[PDB]
Tab-separated table of C-alpha atoms in Angstrom:
chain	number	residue	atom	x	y	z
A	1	UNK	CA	89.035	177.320	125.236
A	2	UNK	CA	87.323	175.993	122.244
A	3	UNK	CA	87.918	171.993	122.151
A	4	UNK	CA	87.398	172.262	118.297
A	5	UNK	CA	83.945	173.870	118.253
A	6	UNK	CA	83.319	176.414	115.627
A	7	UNK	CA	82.710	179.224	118.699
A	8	UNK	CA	84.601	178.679	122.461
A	9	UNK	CA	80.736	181.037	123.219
A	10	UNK	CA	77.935	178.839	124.037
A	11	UNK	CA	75.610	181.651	123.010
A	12	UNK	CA	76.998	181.898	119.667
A	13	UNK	CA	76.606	178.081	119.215
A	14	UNK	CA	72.944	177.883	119.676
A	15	UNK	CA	72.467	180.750	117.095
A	16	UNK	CA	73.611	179.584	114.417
A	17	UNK	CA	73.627	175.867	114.330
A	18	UNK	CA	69.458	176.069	116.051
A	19	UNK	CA	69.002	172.349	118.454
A	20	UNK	CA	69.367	169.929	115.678
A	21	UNK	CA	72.948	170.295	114.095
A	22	UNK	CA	74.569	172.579	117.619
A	23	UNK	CA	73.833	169.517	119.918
A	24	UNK	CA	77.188	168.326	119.029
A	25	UNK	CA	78.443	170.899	119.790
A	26	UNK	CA	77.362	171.240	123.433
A	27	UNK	CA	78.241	167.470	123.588
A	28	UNK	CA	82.019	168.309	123.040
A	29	UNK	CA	82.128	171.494	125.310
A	30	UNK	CA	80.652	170.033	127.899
A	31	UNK	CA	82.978	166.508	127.896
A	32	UNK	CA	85.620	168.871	127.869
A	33	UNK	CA	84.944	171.275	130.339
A	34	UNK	CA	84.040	168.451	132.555
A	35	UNK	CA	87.725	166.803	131.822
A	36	UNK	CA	89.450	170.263	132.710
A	37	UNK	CA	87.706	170.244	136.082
A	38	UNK	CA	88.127	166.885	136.466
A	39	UNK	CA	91.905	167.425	136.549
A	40	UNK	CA	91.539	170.077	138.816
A	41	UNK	CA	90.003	168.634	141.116
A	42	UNK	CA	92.612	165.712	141.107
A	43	UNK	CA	95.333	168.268	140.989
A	44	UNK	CA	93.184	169.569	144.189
A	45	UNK	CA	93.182	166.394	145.811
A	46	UNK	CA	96.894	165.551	145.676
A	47	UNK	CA	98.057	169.123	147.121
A	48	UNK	CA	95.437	168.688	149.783
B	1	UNK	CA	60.525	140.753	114.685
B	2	UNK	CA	61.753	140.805	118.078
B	3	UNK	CA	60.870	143.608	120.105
B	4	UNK	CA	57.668	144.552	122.087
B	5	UNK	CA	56.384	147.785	122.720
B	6	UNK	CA	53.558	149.530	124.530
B	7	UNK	CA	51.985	151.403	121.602
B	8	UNK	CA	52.420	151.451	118.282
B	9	UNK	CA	50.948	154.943	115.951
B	10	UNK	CA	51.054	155.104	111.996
B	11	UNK	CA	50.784	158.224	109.778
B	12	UNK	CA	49.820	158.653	106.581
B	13	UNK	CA	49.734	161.641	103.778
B	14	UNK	CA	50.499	162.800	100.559
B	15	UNK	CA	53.805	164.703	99.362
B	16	UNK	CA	55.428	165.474	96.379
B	17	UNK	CA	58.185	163.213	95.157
B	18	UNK	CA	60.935	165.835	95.438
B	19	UNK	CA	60.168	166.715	99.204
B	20	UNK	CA	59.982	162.859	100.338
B	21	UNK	CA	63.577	163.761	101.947
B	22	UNK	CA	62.086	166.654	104.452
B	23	UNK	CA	60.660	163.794	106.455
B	24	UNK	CA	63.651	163.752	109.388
B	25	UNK	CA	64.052	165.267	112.706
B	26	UNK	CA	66.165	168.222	112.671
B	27	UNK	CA	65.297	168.741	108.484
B	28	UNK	CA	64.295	172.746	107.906
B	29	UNK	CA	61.821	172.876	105.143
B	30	UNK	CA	57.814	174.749	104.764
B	31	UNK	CA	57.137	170.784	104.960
B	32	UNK	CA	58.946	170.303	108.353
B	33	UNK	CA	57.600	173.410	109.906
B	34	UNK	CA	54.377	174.201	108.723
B	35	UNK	CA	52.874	170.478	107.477
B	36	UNK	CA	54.690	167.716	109.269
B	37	UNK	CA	57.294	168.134	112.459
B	38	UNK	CA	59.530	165.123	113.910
B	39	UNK	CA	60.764	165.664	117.409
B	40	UNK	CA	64.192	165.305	117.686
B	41	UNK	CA	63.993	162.284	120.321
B	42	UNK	CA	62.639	160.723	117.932
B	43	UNK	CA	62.665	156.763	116.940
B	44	UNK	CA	60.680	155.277	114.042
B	45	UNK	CA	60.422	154.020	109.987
B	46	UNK	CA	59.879	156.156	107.105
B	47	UNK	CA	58.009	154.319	104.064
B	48	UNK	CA	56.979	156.422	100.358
């Protein structure tokens, strides 16, 4: 998924927006990838 | 006028007029990489 970067690849996020204007960036894929596993785990939890 | 802090460091220089703006973390100019470079964890005052 993407979570309204300008590249769902990390790789391609750190070449062309360099530390300084990407950090964003990495700041929204990582909240969301941390919410999707967040749910899974919950979703884990309850079936267990 | 009503902080502390352990240690406080001043620079000084000369620049043109025009290039007063290339003095920011994160700025891309010959300036910012080959005179002057601001960390990008950076905190601090910028007087011209």
């Amino acid at each position: 998924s993407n979570f309204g970067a300008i590249s769902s690849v990390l790789n391609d996020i750190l070449s062309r927006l360099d530390p300084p204007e990407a950090e964003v960036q990495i700041d929204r894929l990582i909240t969301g990838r941390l919410q999707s596993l967040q749910t899974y785990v919950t979703q884990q939890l309850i079936r267990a | 006028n009503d902080l502390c802090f352990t240690n406080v460091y001043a620079d000084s220089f000369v620049i043109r007029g025009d290039e007063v703006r290339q003095i920011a973390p994160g700025q891309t100019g010959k300036i910012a990489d080959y005179n002057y470079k601001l960390p990008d964890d950076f905190t601090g005052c910028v007087i011209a």
